[PDB]
């Protein structure tokens, strides 16, 4: 029901993958709600939301308003809840507001218990914040995003993933000896690595510039097919 | 002088760029001391530091030991100050220790007054922490590492760069249309962009596997030459 996608490393493509996965789920007839937990709030821009749209659940909670009115509907089977723009002073001092977003966990629990949303994707950052840990606790399933390179290989042996987190590969190049070696090592060593990997496709680099998910921006791209396969796998496995 | 390298986004290539820059500066006859401040602590491995080597300034101060004892002699003109490994509980609870690492700042000022090292490179993370802000203030010059993609272009117009920081482009790919468009836009929308670019070289991907700087790994690669050009520009401009 709850599928939280978190990046082992920054820049692996957590937000674009989350948008593509949400679009693929909504293309299969499932009700989808996307929640951007990233403080930078870059997920809204992938759904044709104006950059000046300051609304967001976190912004409403900090301002004392009701976050439920901050929801944005993309399509009948896809709803969006952007984080909300934060002022420079707030970004410089995250500790002054990190503990003020407690009620969002209760709201997400109520949304899950409602049944109107069959899938509630959460775009999580990597900052070890208390709200992030609470969201991980309320997440039924997790997907840790890694890339086939030395940095992610190093990370996978010292930092602890949340329990139950499958490993997903993104930005997989073609014709790199070190990358092939690391991929084979992960195939024969990493039990939680998913069977699906997403090759480097310029469609993923152009989806954010086009302010659309890669599924809607270009369905015929290889990235779209891989994301749809990942969505079907998630439906099969994470449903219960 | 004191130069601090920080990335506007995770995984842009800040650590590898810092290590290559330190090697390029030391191979030109300048004494360079490089300090690892990111909690991930991945700067050591580029200098043939064993993974089991848990000695680091952060851990040294957390155990009541002397942080100066955690230094390593790599070459006669490069010394390293490893951050040190953190336990899983420490990683998941940064607040319990992130305010106890301030002692390194005044010690770094003392080191700046020592004069032994002509360059003090710092691996500045982007955790928006008090220590990060203090170290950034202590840095005489700041270099912001960005990539030519949608995410970095979005971030540059909604996040604040360090005062006087200059922008360096890493992971400049080949045959990408959106990359060319964004670079042409930045050629006039930004005035802080350096005239040198770092390409997507396999040597930079393999350097971390070989536990060597890219120049030390292979000095004939174009990325190493670009790092050397960056070092020359820093010498000509960031001298004072």
């Amino acid at each position: 029901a709850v599928l939280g996608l978190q990046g082992v490393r920054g820049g692996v493509g957590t937000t674009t993958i989350t948008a593509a996965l949400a679009w693929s789920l909504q293309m299969l007839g499932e009700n989808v709600l996307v929640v951007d937990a990233c403080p930078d709030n870059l997920l809204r821009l992938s759904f044709n939301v104006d950059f000046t749209h300051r609304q967001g659940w976190a912004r409403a909670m900090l301002d004392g308003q009701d976050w439920r009115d901050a929801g944005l509907r993309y399509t009948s089977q896809l709803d969006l809840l952007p984080f909300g723009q934060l002022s420079i002073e707030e970004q410089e001092n995250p500790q002054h507001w990190q503990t003020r977003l407690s009620d969002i966990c209760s709201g997400l629990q109520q949304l899950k218990a409602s049944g109107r949303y069959q899938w509630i994707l959460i775009d999580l950052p990597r900052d070890a914040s208390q709200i992030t840990h609470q969201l991980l606790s309320l997440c039924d399933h997790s997907l840790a995003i890694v890339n086939v390179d030395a940095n992610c290989h190093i990370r996978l042996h010292q930092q602890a993933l949340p329990d139950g987190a499958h490993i997903l590969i993104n930005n997989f190049r073609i014709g790199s000896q070190v990358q092939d070696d690391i991929y084979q090592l992960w195939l024969q060593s990493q039990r939680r690595l998913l069977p699906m990997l997403i090759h480097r496709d310029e469609a993923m680099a152009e989806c954010l510039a086009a302010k659309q998910p890669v599924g809607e921006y270009r369905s015929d791209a290889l990235a779209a097919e891989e994301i749809l396969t990942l969505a079907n796998w998630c439906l099969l496995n994470y449903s219960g | 002088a004191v130069l601090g390298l920080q990335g506007v986004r995770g995984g842009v290539g800040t650590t590898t760029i810092t290590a290559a820059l330190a090697w390029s500066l030391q191979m030109l006859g300048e004494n360079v001391l490089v300090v690892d401040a990111c909690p991930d602590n991945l700067l050591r491995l580029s200098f043939n530091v064993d993974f089991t080597h848990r000695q680091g300034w952060a851990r040294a101060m957390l155990d009541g030991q002397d942080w100066r004892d955690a230094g390593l002699r790599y070459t006669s003109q490069l010394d390293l100050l490893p951050f040190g490994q953190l336990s899983i509980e420490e990683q998941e609870n940064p607040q319990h220790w992130q305010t106890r690492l301030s002692d390194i700042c005044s010690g770094l000022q003392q080191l700046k007054a020592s004069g032994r090292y002509q360059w003090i490179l710092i691996d500045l993370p982007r955790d928006a922490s008090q220590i990060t802000h203090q170290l950034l203030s202590l840095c005489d010059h700041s270099l912001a590492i960005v990539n030519v993609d949608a995410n970095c272009h979005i971030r540059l117009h909604q996040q604040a760069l360090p005062d006087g920081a200059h922008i360096l482009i890493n992971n400049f790919r080949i045959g990408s249309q959106v990359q060319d468009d964004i670079y042409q836009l930045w050629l006039q929308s930004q005035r802080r962009l350096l005239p040198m670019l770092i390409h997507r070289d396999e040597a930079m991907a393999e350097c971390l596997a070989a536990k060597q700087p890219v120049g030390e790994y292979r000095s004939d690669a174009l990325a190493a030459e670009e790092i050397l050009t960056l070092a020359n520009w820093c010498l000509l401009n960031y001298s004072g």
């Binding site: 030395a150 290989h153 042996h157 | 596997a209």
Partner: peptide, 29 residues
């Protein structure tokens, strides 16, 4: 994490991969 490094050196391609890159060999031990 779930790491099973046992019985890895039994493959020629994996052995070559570990030999070529010291980082992989250091981690796999």
């Amino acid at each position: 994490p779930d790491i099973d490094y046992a019985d890895i050196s039994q493959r020629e391609q994996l052995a070559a991969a570990l030999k070529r890159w010291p980082l992989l060999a250091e981690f796999a031990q």
